Design a protein around this ligand. Structure first.
Ligand SMILES: [Ca+2]
Length: 119
């Protein structure tokens, strides 16, 4: 099943990676992240589920036109930094698995800067 693995990439890994690394942001983004980390946990690997926070909306905001997520508590910033790094490692493995299965050539993307801060 190429489809099963494509759904993990398209419905979980890619949107969550983009939410924390691409400049795209809407009035729906915090709720979309909440949805990914609750409703779409069934698409995550067990390693990531160990560290992925359950809650996000009330822990951070984008302020002043910045692309950065501003965390209010250092501890939440640290939890998210750790989880994003795990998310990225899982993502690259799921990409490798997709290409192993599809038989096509690997173009592994470079890791982005996480758009997160607290200080
Ligand atoms: Ca918020």
């Amino acid at each position: 099943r190429l489809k099963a693995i494509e759904d993990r990439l398209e419905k979980f890994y890619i949107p969550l990676i983009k939410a924390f690394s691409s400049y795209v942001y809407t009035a729906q983004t915090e709720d979309e992240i909440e949805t990914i980390i609750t409703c779409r946990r069934y698409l995550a690997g067990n390693n990531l589920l160990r560290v992925l926070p359950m809650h996000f909306k009330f822990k951070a905001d984008k302020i002043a036109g910045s692309a950065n997520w501003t965390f209010y508590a250092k501890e939440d910033f640290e939890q998210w930094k750790e989880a994003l790094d795990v998310l990225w490692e899982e993502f690259l493995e799921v990409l490798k698995e997709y290409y192993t299965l599809s038989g096509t050539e690997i173009s592994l993307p470079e890791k982005p800067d996480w758009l997160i801060g607290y200080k």
